[PDB]
Amino acid sequence: HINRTALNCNDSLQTGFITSLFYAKNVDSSGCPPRPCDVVSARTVCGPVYCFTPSPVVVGTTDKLGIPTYNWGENETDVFMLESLRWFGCTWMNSTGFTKTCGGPWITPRCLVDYPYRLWHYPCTVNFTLHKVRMFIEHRFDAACN
């Protein structure tokens, strides 16, 4: 299951974004102030791809047919079929450390669905407050609002 993660992380801009992939760190909140979910080539992605059904769900690498691949997203035929799991949004980190999104985890402009890598992809949501949300089939997930 681990091999299904894109590891095309090259920090050519030298921002140090990769360390928060492996360690929670201390989010650097200082410096802080419309695509549909198609298919995503895997060699542009660094780390896990999270789609929200709204419940957080990890998307693994597949080929162009939906067959799981286990090459860490190295071959060009590795993709992320985001349009196969439909409010619906996805997010991930591209190779040079930018947060990519399609439609993300924002149920509202105010609240965002929590998941293990929320603060990596969105470092400016750290001071947000979490609380349980129940809503219908029922989804058990947590949200982060101002």
């Epitope: 299951h1 681990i2 993660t5 590891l7 992380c9 920090d11 990769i18 360390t19 992939l21 492996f22 360690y23 929670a24 780390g47 896990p48 990890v58 293990p116 890598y117």
Partner: antibody
């Protein structure tokens, strides 16, 4: 499989430097944190630093931040530990250990946390 | 940093007794706590990770528990191979820090 093999037991003089190597095998080198832990004779374990070979993610204990450098070389999957300005206090058994990262605590589901694999250790004596 | 203190620092027991070692942390470490067993001359052997979860291959007589800033390692009944030194180690924060160790020796 999954083993860390260590060697380079060396006797050095004060002021010199020593370079210790750690050949990893049996797991994906890039993803795990190769950490270094030393044990002075009759003393406890002391964590020195860790490297994550993919991003070259290094972190050191602050006491060693101006003497130790840890390097990856993902080609041969061999973590290195270079300690300079050697002191008599650096006489110790230096261990290589594999530590899990956030990418394994999440989206792995294959158990085994902490430092779950250790090298044999190499003994380094520093004396005049 | 996070200071890890164990209790007791020395303990004398015989074969078949139940042992509990305490490990205290200067902050809460969210059960990110590991236990190792070291015999003199050998590398530490991984024992427990994540406070409660058992490392690969170790017998069921070892177990760990706790939460927040206080954890415990318990051996159901000691066996001759179990006499050694035991270290705890938090991995919630950097630097990783160990406790001073507890030496479990044979009673006679």
């Amino acid at each position: 499989q999954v083993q860390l093999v260590q060697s380079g037991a060396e006797v050095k003089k004060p002021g010199a430097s020593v370079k210790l190597s750690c050949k990893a095998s049996g797991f994906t080198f890039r993803i795990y944190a190769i950490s270094w832990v030393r044990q002075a004779p009759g003393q406890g374990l002391e964590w020195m630093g860790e490297i994550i070979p993919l991003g070259g993610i290094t972190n050191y204990a602050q006491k060693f931040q101006g003497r130790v450098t840890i390097t990856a070389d993902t080609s041969t999957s061999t973590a290195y530990m270079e300690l300079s300005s050697l002191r008599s206090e650096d006489t110790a058994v230096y261990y290589c250990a594999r530590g899990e990262t956030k990418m394994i605590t999440v989206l792995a589901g294959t158990t085994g946390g902490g430092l779950d694999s250790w090298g044999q250790g190499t003994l380094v004596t520093v004396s005049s | 940093d996070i200071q890890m203190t164990q209790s007791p620092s020395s303990l004398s027991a015989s074969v078949g007794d139940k042992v509990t070692i305490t490990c205290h942390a200067s902050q809460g470490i969210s059960s990110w706590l590991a236990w190792y067993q070291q015999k003199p001359g050998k590398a530490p052997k991984p024992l427990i990770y994540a406070a409660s979860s058992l490392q690969s291959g170790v017998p069921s007589r070892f177990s760990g528990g706790g939460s927040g800033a206080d954890y415990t390692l318990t051996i159901s009944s000691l066996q001759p191979e179990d006499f050694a030194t035991y270290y705890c180690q938090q991995y919630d924060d950097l630097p990783r820090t160990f406790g001073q160790g507890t030496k479990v020796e044979i009673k006679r």
